Design a protein around this nucleic acid. Sequence first.
RNA 1: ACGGAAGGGCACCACCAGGAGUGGAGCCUGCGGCUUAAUUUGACUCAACACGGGGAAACUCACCAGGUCCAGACACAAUAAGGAUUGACAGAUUGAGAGCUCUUUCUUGAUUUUGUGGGUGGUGGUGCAUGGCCGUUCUUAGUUGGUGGAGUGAUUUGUCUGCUUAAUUGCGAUAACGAACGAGACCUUAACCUACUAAAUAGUGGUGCUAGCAUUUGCUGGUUAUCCACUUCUUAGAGGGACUAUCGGUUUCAAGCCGAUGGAAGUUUGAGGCAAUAACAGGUCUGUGAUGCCCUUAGACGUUCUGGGCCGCACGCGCGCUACACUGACGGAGCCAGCGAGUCUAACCUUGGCCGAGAGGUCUUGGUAAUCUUGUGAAACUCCGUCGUGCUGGGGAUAGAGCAUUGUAAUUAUUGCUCUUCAACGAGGAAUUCCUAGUAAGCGCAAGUCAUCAGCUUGCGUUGAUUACGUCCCUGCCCUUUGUACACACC
Lengths: 107, 71, 96, 143, 67, 158, 347, 53
Amino acid sequence: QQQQIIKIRITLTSTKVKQLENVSSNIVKNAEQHNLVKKGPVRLPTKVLKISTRKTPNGEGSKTWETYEMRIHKRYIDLEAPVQIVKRITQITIEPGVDVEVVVASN
Amino acid sequence: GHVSQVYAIRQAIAKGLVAYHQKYVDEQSKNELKKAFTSYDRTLLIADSRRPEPKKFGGKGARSRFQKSYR
Amino acid sequence: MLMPKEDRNKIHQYLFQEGVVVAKKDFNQAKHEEIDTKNLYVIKALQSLTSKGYVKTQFSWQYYYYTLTEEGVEYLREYLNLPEHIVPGTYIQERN
Amino acid sequence: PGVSVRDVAAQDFINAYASFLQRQGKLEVPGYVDIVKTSSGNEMPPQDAEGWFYKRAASVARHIYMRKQVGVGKLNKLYGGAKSRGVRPYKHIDASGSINRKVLQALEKIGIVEISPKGGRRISENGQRDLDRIAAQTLEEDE
Amino acid sequence: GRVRTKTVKRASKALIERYYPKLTLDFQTNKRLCDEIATIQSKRLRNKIAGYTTHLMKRIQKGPVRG
Amino acid sequence: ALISKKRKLVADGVFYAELNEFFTRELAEEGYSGVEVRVTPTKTEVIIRATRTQDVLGENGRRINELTLLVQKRFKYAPGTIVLYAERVQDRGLSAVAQAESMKFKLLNGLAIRRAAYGVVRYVMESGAKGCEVVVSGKLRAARAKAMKFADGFLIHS
Amino acid sequence: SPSILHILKEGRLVAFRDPNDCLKLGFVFKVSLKDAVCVIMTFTKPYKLPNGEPNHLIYFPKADGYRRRNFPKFQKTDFYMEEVPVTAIEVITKRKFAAPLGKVIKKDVAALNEFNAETNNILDGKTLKEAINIEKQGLKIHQILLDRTNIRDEIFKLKSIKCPNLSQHIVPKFKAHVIKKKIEELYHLMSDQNLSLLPDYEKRLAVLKDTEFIDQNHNVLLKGRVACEINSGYELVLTELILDNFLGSFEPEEIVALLSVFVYEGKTREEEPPIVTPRLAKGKQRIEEIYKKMLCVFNTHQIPLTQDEAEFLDRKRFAMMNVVYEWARGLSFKEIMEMSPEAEGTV
Amino acid sequence: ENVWFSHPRRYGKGSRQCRVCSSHTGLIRKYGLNICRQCFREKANDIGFNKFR
RNA sequence: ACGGAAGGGCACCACCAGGAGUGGAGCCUGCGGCUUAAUUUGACUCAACACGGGGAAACUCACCAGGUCCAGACACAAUAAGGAUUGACAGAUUGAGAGCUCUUUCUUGAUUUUGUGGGUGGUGGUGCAUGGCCGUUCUUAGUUGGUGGAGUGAUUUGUCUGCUUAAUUGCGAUAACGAACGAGACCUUAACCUACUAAAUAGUGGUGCUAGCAUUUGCUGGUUAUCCACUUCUUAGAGGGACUAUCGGUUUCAAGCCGAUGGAAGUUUGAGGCAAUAACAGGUCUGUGAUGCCCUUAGACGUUCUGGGCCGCACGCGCGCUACACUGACGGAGCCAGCGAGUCUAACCUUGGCCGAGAGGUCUUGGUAAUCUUGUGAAACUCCGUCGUGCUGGGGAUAGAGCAUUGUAAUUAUUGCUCUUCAACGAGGAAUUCCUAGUAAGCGCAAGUCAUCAGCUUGCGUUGAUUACGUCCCUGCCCUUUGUACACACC
């Protein structure tokens, strides 16, 4: 009767930085409060979705191009945590835009 | 590339040496080293601050543009 | 459009039992989802229905958003011959 | 077309070996070797002729040496010429991979290299102690 | 070229007018003083303002400036 | 599930777009302003903003139910996973979209352009804005086209 | 899942069964991800025991002592299709073939021979490895797996395991435990604690015990006593208002006007005027604080309040302080009316 | 009805189209979105591709 | 507004100083004409001509030779279960198991049906009837109205005599006074943090297991497991950092400017994004279920099937990328990157072993991705050998013959390889394009179209120059003065 540790791995990803980092920091805080070892707030290389296209709808006009780009910021956070805290930490921390995932059984 | 790599390695050798002197030897020696290097400076200690400017549309390169006709 | 009457019955029925119908604008689609009929047949029967009131349409991104009316409900009860004050489309249902 | 000779004795490192591989009497030629272009995007066969395969042997010995573990496809990518089509300048394009495969199959037999986990092929401890030691003994002799 | 704009100059002047105690003729000290003394939006702009104040103080010491 | 993050985010964006357009089309009379695709664990909430929840919400939740059906039958969701709502937009204005709709409706009733434009601008001013700009292109009065450009207060373009 | 549709292989070995309840085996047509409607192609009839009864034991992987005890072979049957949910499918296994069901149906030479071979190869010998992937996510699923695979090895831990014949003798025991606690225990539970209002009531006790109105042994305290007089819905805050000398500073008028916040709807368009005296404002502030606290305490337990009580602070209730205060002095009814926003009957 | 009213459209410009407008030339397949380039431009900020560079 | 008028200031879409070139470096595609059954079509100085994201084997397709199909909603008559209408194996039929049509008859059961109003669709017309979008005027410093003043008024002043700035930027002056937009500021990105937050999806170091060629302990992996330690490199988040900082000169000595010092960064630190007012009867109805009016609406310019054509051509003009040869091209031994991109309701990126000269085929494996492809060990270029001046050897076209792949289908060859014809070509009149720093120029690489095809573009790195650092002479732009018989404004 230990309430056994399972090595949780959260994987946050979003197009926003301030709305995402907020959730990250919150996760860091709550998880700290419960007194658990963890693997950082590890941040990944931000992925730029670049789309090059002509400005004009039809061929006439000086040949002007237009970069249209969307950011993808991604954070993975490993909480070496018990079976108790999974349900407590999953229910909290939800946000429009911030795509949240959680995964376990690391091998 | 090759030249660039060479430049990097020499720089590393320099900085590594001066830093080593700074920590594990007296300062005067390090000063002597600097002054020997910095007088000659081929980006010896300090890095080369030029970095590739981006390519822009209506041309093969950055400042280069395509040829126009009129007729 | 000309089609077997059973398919029409299925259409009118399913629409009554839900209230909404959807359809990707594709003639030469073959079977349409949920209702057991080709998509063209659906789309044209629903157009026919719309013609004289009864159901309202909104095109939007080539996906045909059909929605039933009050007169439409009366028409469908008449066609499908089932009792009033018992089987409607989607009126109250939910508590809120 | 190729890689990793800039450093040490490019030609001499893999020339005293080439004749020494013939000296060994263990080498295992394909049969259709030496009447071949060596790459799809090339033009002529090698000018060594009575040789070349022995250069490419020690070059593949050097390749397995190079690092960790190497494969077939990688070798194709490497010795591949890049192909000249019309205007279409010199787009990097795979080699006569069969030759590299043959070389591998030879080297494995001679007791230099073996097939590894994670796929690929790896150098042995007994392997190159004798092989390219005599060729690079020229550098030890001159010193 | 390297000409200082309206919002840098005017604001700087205003600051010197209502804060002559403090604003010693050093850049870096003013730079933080500016962050404290009043709300500035960007860093660049703030720095520019600080620089101009430093310049003004430097040329206030020699004689009484008109304005 | 099992879609790349790249592909996924783009799909979400697409979903948002198609939603906004559909709502703009269907919720025209109500004075639709905007939406937000509020994804949650399991459920997927969708807040809708308009000037009035007169018939958008419906009588006893009828039109809203219809809308939900349209949403979930279109994109193919499990019933009761996707959910719609109806929040009040703030200040009947400042949101430009609603104002544009108001113009559109003012015109199509049968009115001169000036009255519409200046009505809109005045309303905007009343709503506590810095300033406004209303431009009307096309065929005003004559057969040849013309661009009338009304404004008040203040703006920025850079 | 990462291998739920295509990768696992079309015609993969699964153990399904209809309400007859016997150990069967078959090939998957297509894993329909919508209504769970898999069309399984069985090759074995309901495997009844030597006695002639429905077999209840499931294939519990990796054990010669477990399965060969009662399952040396199964019955051989030719192809025929049946639709079934995923709930009925018990344990998926490896021994399968890549070729489709259509080929088997239409009488091929390559399909049928290999097919029959696979049909009887399974029968001849079978000690298979179970394979369901956890690599997608696994949070609830992982937990379930943990629960089950510990109970998997627990089947060997207990006394009954190396019997000569277990499933022949189980039909009485099975009949007893399953059917006797089918709708007797359950019917009893349908007249013991029926609704979720009793559980929720016990959660309402958690907040009532925490707020110190009733004591922890579930009996009434002074706070609960005083509160027993108040019949209004906003009784807890009001109960909390009477504790300290905070009220002693006020005059009777000030008290009565302060008390108006509770007994008023407060749904109107017009704006609240400035408060008639600072003490009243202070009181209002205190009330607001207390109601915030109460909202917080209710919110920890996670119980939904009424629309009135959810709103309370958002609603415009606080203007009637300024109204009734003047009345409490001794003023005319016109004067007060001309101060107040709301209708007269309401006032 | 008709076993003659469909040519092969397994690939090419004729097979797949812009979901908004249903053109063929000027189709944005990148990131599997399949939007007419002009249409994409129109709904670019809607989807959330903002012009930085 | 214009001026072969004046004054002041500017720009490599202007020169000078040169560098690279274009009219024969691949022979390509684009347009014109010509040809055409059709050889669809828009755009014609800048601001049309590898542009329409237009690299089309069919579908794209709009054009041409033909063949069907109705998706003519609806209302109103009329035929009408002694049947409205539909479908139909097969003979004929025709490119064609298209009943399209006929031949023979079976099936069908209010849906349609022929007619009348009225719709509907259209890559039909009209971009000079419009919307949106974009281009350009206009890589520029310019525009406005509140209250004043001047003038009968159009209007003007403010918005300027100088000085300075990339800049109506400022400094100042002053019938104007405060104000707003544009510029700047702002945003992203490019570089500097041996400080903070950390990171087996990024590294490095130490300890158990490797030392096999230049090795004694290169650096590498053995090492997803051997555990520990670390955050310089690598990734981000948060902040700091440059403000012309200090010194000198120079100027009513003010704004500023030129040099020096330190500094990662001192041309608004570079690069972009954003970009005012008023315009053009610029382009687009072939992006749009954006649309007005017009045209057509069942031998339909509707939709759809068969087959062509847009590739019809030694070019009449326009852009475009390898090395005209010894700072070369080979044979090897060559060769470090950085943007990216990637399979689901499926077949994308391919590591691996086998077979194959080859392209490829195969058995599998890893990967929804800083983890696997993939240190995309790219190319130019470092090292030795082979030619060495020769329309030759240098390197592999134009034509033929085979073998592969993709695709219903490759024939007017999709591409790829292989051998035989052998060609970076004799430095390209007149003319004209781009260019001042990590740029120009060289060289590849990815992505965008995509089943297959790049020489097209869009970004990315790699090697890395000369020559100004100026001017108003040519080509134009901005302001002020002036002149004007112009105002669709010098065409």
